Amino acid sequence: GKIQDSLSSTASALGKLQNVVNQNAQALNTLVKQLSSNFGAISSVLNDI
Amino acid sequence: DSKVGGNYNYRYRLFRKSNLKPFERDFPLQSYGFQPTNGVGYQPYRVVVLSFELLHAPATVCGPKKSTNLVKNKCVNFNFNGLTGTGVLTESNKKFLPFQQFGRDIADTTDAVRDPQTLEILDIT
Amino acid sequence: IKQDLICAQKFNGLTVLPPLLTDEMIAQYTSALLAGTI
Amino acid sequence: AYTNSFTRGVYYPDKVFRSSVLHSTQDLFLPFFSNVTWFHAIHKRFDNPVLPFNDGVYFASTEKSNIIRGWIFGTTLDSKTQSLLIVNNATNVVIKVCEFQFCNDPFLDVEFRVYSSANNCTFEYVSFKNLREFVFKNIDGYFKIYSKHTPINLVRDLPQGFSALEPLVDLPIGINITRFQTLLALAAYYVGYLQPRTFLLKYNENGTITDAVDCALD
Numbered sequence: 001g002k003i004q005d006s007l008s009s010t011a012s013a014l015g016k017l018q019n020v021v022n023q024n025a026q027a028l029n030t031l032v033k034q035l036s037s038n039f040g041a042i043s044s045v046l047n048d049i
Numbered sequence: 050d051s052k053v054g055g056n057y058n059y060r061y062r063l064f065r066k067s068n069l070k071p072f073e074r075d076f077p078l079q080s081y082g083f084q085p086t087n088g089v090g091y092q093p094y095r096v097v098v099l100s101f102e103l104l105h106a107p108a109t110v111c112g113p114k115k116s117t118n119l120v121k122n123k124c125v126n127f128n129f130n131g132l133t134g135t136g137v138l139t140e141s142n143k144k145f146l147p148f149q150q151f152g153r154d155i156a157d158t159t160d161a162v163r164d165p166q167t168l169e170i171l172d173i174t
Numbered sequence: 175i176k177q178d179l180i181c182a183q184k185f186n187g188l189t190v191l192p193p194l195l196t197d198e199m200i201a202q203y204t205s206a207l208l209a210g211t212i
Numbered sequence: 213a214y215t216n217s218f219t220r221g222v223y224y225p226d227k228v229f230r231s232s233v234l235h236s237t238q239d240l241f242l243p244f245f246s247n248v249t250w251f252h253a254i255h256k257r258f259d260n261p262v263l264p265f266n267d268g269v270y271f272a273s274t275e276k277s278n279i280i281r282g283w284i285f286g287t288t289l290d291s292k293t294q295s296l297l298i299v300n301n302a303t304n305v306v307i308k309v310c311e312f313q314f315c316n317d318p319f320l321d322v323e324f325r326v327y328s329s330a331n332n333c334t335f336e337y338v339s340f341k342n343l344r345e346f347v348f349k350n351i352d353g354y355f356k357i358y359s360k361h362t363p364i365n366l367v368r369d370l371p372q373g374f375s376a377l378e379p380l381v382d383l384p385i386g387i388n389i390t391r392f393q394t395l396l397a398l399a400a401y402y403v404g405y406l407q408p409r410t411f412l413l414k415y416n417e418n419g420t421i422t423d424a425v426d427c428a429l430d
């Protein structure tokens with residue numbers, strides 16, 4: 001029963017899991033964010049170029 | 050522009066304290082020696098610079114291209130005011146304020162457009 | 175089944191495959207192991 | 213006088229719709245909690261001084277009975293150079309770019325004693341209880357005006373609240389502007405100076421930005 005209340009009370013006990021999933025998103029996020037990067041060209045969009 | 054007597058109406062700023070900022074306009078003024086006997090490199094040459102600015106803002110000036118009937122539900126090649134891409138076009142409830150014409154996604158890629166002929170906001174997927 | 179951040183990631187070719195063992199078969203395995211233990 | 217500009221000077225930075233997203237943008241915005249200069253229109257107090265215009269200016273006007281009725285922009289204000297005059301007179305709104313010859317104290321009466329001559333005219337167009345937020349900006353020959361109106365019930369201060377500003381008009385005046393002066397009718401008005409700052413805007417599902425955050429306030 002003490003576990004049932006504990007998991008119902010705290011949210012950090014599952015940190016080791018969220019730390020995984022968050023990263024799976026975060027790296028994906030920056031993997032999309034690099035599309036906005038121009039890398040030195042005159043425009044960062046392909047159809048513009 | 051090379052009258053025989055010397056078209057001295059044309060002149061250039063010979064001296065200035067510091068280099069001026071780009072696209073700025075202002076004895077410091079000396080006349081050109083434009084005469085018909087002047088050689089190549091010394092003759093008068095007219096210059097016109099077309100400094101068109103194209104950040105995604107309501108466009109108003111561009112060449113002859115015939116617009117055609119717009120279709121929905123079927124993904125096609127599209128070109129709105131020079132913005133070229135491919136995708137489906139669907140009626141969008143994303144309420145652009147009267148100044149917005151394009152919408153961009155997280156990837157800095159367009160996902161919503163205002164048609165230049167009918168003032169309607171359309172989602173692109 | 176895709177038919178938002180998730181959609182923006184997906185549209186650029188970044189797709190997510192589903193795990194073979196869905197949550198139901200994982201729960202069944204857990205229940206089996208628990209029953210065996212008890 | 214000076215007043216703390218708690219949460220003002222924010223405008224939509226671009227013409228892109230977004231919703232439920234935090235967006236970072238670098239643009240000439242008003243820094244939060246800055247000392248904006250305060251002018252009054254009492255009875256007695258009719259101050260209409262000429263204020264410098266650099267890197268864009270945010271204007272706020274707590275008004276009743278429509279006292280503030282326009283603005284002038286220039287660099288010499290003596291017909292030596294061009295100047296842009298925006299007026300909302302009892303018939304309509306008129307904007308006009310000319311080498312105007314101005315009076316020492318330009319004002320309107322309920323008269324049009326604002327300028328005495330217009331030599332060379334190039335661009336022309338003819339169309340407390342209230343609060344008007346304007347943000348003026350002059351970039352590469354294009355003068356942009358953002359404008360928002362809001363009802364208020366306050367006595368002698370800028371309300372502490374948040375409201376995004378929306379663009380209304382962009383003019384290709386292309387003239388050099390260094391100073392400005394508001395036009396009064398014979399209320400209170402705050403002036404603040406815009407700085408290049410990076411901001412964080414929170415779009416909500418409806419697409420109207422709800423929160424703004426400085427990257428260098430503290």
Ligand SMILES: *[C@@H]1O[C@H](CO)[C@@H](O)[C@H](O)[C@H]1NC(C)=O
Nearest residue numbers: 073074075287288388389390
């Ligand atoms: C604009 O006017 C100011 C003040 O007269 C002057 O210092 C500045 O050089 C002018 N800019 C241009 C581009 O002429």
Ligand SMILES: *[C@@H]1O[C@H](CO)[C@@H](O)[C@H](O)[C@H]1NC(C)=O
Nearest residue numbers: 116117164165166167168169
């Ligand atoms: C252009 O489009 C608008 C909106 O559809 C319409 O009212 C107008 O008549 C059109 N003009 C021409 C010349 O097609």
Ligand SMILES: *[C@@H]1O[C@H](CO)[C@@H](O)[C@H](O)[C@H]1NC(C)=O
Nearest residue numbers: 214215216243245246247248
């Ligand atoms: C604002 O006013 C306060 C109090 O007088 C002063 O301490 C501070 O330096 C001022 N800040 C600015 C930006 O003028």
Ligand SMILES: *[C@@H]1O[C@H](CO)[C@@H](O)[C@H](O)[C@H]1NC(C)=O
Nearest residue numbers: 301302303304305306324338
């Ligand atoms: C307001 O200004 C316009 C533009 O100059 C002018 O035509 C009109 O007569 C003015 N109205 C009044 C009441 O002064």
Ligand SMILES: *[C@@H]1O[C@H](CO)[C@@H](O)[C@H](O)[C@H]1NC(C)=O
Nearest residue numbers: 291292293294311331332333
């Ligand atoms: C104003 O117009 C007159 C008449 O064309 C001209 O002589 C003068 O140079 C102009 N002043 C300017 C453009 O500042």
Ligand SMILES: *[C@@H]1O[C@H](CO)[C@@H](O)[C@H](O)[C@H]1NC(C)=O
Nearest residue numbers: 232415416417418419420422
């Ligand atoms: C969006 O606007 C609707 C209509 O007024 C309102 O009911 C809703 O609460 C708004 N939501 C947000 C997040 O502003």
